[PDB]
Amino acid sequence: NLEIGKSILAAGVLTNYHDVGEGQPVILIHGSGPGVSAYANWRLTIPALSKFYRVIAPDMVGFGFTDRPENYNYSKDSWVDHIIGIMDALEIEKAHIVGNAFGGGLAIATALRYSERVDRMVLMGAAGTRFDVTEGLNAVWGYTPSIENMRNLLDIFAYDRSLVTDELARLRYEASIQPGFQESFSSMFPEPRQRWIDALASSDEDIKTLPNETLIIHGREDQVVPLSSSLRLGELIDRAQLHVFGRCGHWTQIEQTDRFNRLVVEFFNEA
Amino acid sequence: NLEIGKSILAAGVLTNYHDVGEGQPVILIHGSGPGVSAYANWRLTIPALSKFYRVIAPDMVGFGFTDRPENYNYSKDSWVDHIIGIMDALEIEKAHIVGNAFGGGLAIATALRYSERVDRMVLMGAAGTRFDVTEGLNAVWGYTPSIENMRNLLDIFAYDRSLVTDELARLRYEASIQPGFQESFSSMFPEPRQRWIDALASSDEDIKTLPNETLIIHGREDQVVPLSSSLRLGELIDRAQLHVFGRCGHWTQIEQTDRFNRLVVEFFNEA
DSSP states (O other): OTTOOEEEEETTEEEEEEEEOOSSEEEEEOOOSTTOOHHHHHTTTHHHHTTTSEEEEEOOTTSTTSOOOTTOOOOHHHHHHHHHHHHHHTTOOSEEEEEETHHHHHHHHHHHHOGGGEEEEEEESOOOSOOOOOHHHHHHHTOOSOHHHHHHHHHHHOSSGGGOOHHHHHHHHHHHTSTTHHHHHHHHSOSSTHHHHHHHOOOHHHHTTOOSOEEEEEETTOSSSOHHHHHHHHHHOTTEEEEEESSOOSOHHHHTHHHHHHHHHHHHHTO | OTTOOEEEEETTEEEEEEEEOOSSEEEEEOOOSTTOOHHHHHTTTHHHHTTTSEEEEEOOTTSTTSOOOTTOOOOHHHHHHHHHHHHHHTTOOSEEEEEETHHHHHHHHHHHHOGGGEEEEEEESOOOSOOOOOHHHHHHHTOOSOHHHHHHHHHHHOSSGGGOOHHHHHHHHHHHTSTTHHHHHHHHSOSSTHHHHHHHOOOHHHHTTOOSOEEEEEETTOSSSOHHHHHHHHHHOTTEEEEEESSOOSOHHHHTHHHHHHHHHHHHHTO
8 A cells, every 4th residue: 555654653643654855855734535645645746846855745643544543632733733743753843845725724834833844835725714614625524435425525626527537436435434534534524614614724914924935826626625715825925926727626736737746846946 | 229129020010029049939028118118028038938939029019119100000909910910020820929918918819819820828917807997007008207207107016116226217217208109108098098908908708718728927916907807817718827926016027037937938838
């Protein structure tokens, strides 16, 4: 299983992660969704970025193959603690962070609590602002296992539905039912789900204080997080650039892979 | 005077233009404003792009050093005719077009009337939609010569006012008073100026038909054309990408030069 990588104790949690490349450290933070893992989210990104940077992609606690502590309390602050714990464990004093969706909210929160540990940021279809819950998001967070339910989620994520094959739905369905996966995921964002969008968000006032060079990326057709949310982040963050990909869904790194990788590498190359 | 380049008869008008590089043709179309010329607008862009493309930058009729025909009727359609005439004169059957501001409106109009002659498009703080006239635009089009009036215009264009020096104001003022320059410019967009924004615009219905891969660029702080106009173009054009530069004014190619050049070259490289 390529989703299983290396293991390290971080913030007291046995963590599954990938570490490829050398040089300036870059932390990739995956999004949320049933069966999501660092490898699943970044498999097409790591090869490109690792040619010029040291790429670290961990499975956030509660997702993938990282340990799921008993009675663990999933929260924005606890996830930030996990990210910092991973960096501490690997002696990464400062790094760029790429946050995808849920991970984008965590990236913002990490940059606010640990400004000196974060260099440049890339936020993709990111959580971080209090947007109104979408049917797409309620479907993703409210997922229960079945190939048809997964097919619907993949349709929600994709702009080009031709990419949603029976094989892909089957594979992601299987990932979603691995031991303990659905149990932890379903416990994370219970109804009403607006509460969790809000909890993952940072205040306008706080976001405005971010000094980091930031690259905001969003798929025009994103059905999970409205484009308006990234436009808002683009107005709040001072040193920000906003790049909107037309004909692109929620996962920009998958549907606009080459454009995404090029944009991100050049962005980091400036530093 | 580096603003004076080569001369060629195009659409019956003796045209001043620059032609540098070899390979895939790229037409650069400057914006509008007192003293504006192809060289003034693209001097920092041509060197970069010409390393990989054949770059053609003409002074549109009524601007720069191109002839100003007596009783000439300046119009969107006539300017499009000029662009096509330049391409015909140089045996350029198909080319990418980079339209800055006013030039962006012309690029859209050219792609609509001569779709087969246009490949990829880059539209910067572009005209093309019916946005409400801004004080910045009324100041630019309503300009009358003086170093102080020019200093105000440069302030309107720039995000970083430190770039607006006495020397720059003086040089641009001098460019604005060259023989016949102010006379033709002041005759172009008389009050009420909303009429000209509308005349330079293309309908939503027409824009939606554009099949060209397009890159829309806009400076967050643009005081001349509101960001909302480019966001609208980003929703209307199907194969579009929108890139918003924070801490950037109306002329993105000048204040975010390196980022701009990189983005444009890679965009064209895809073809």
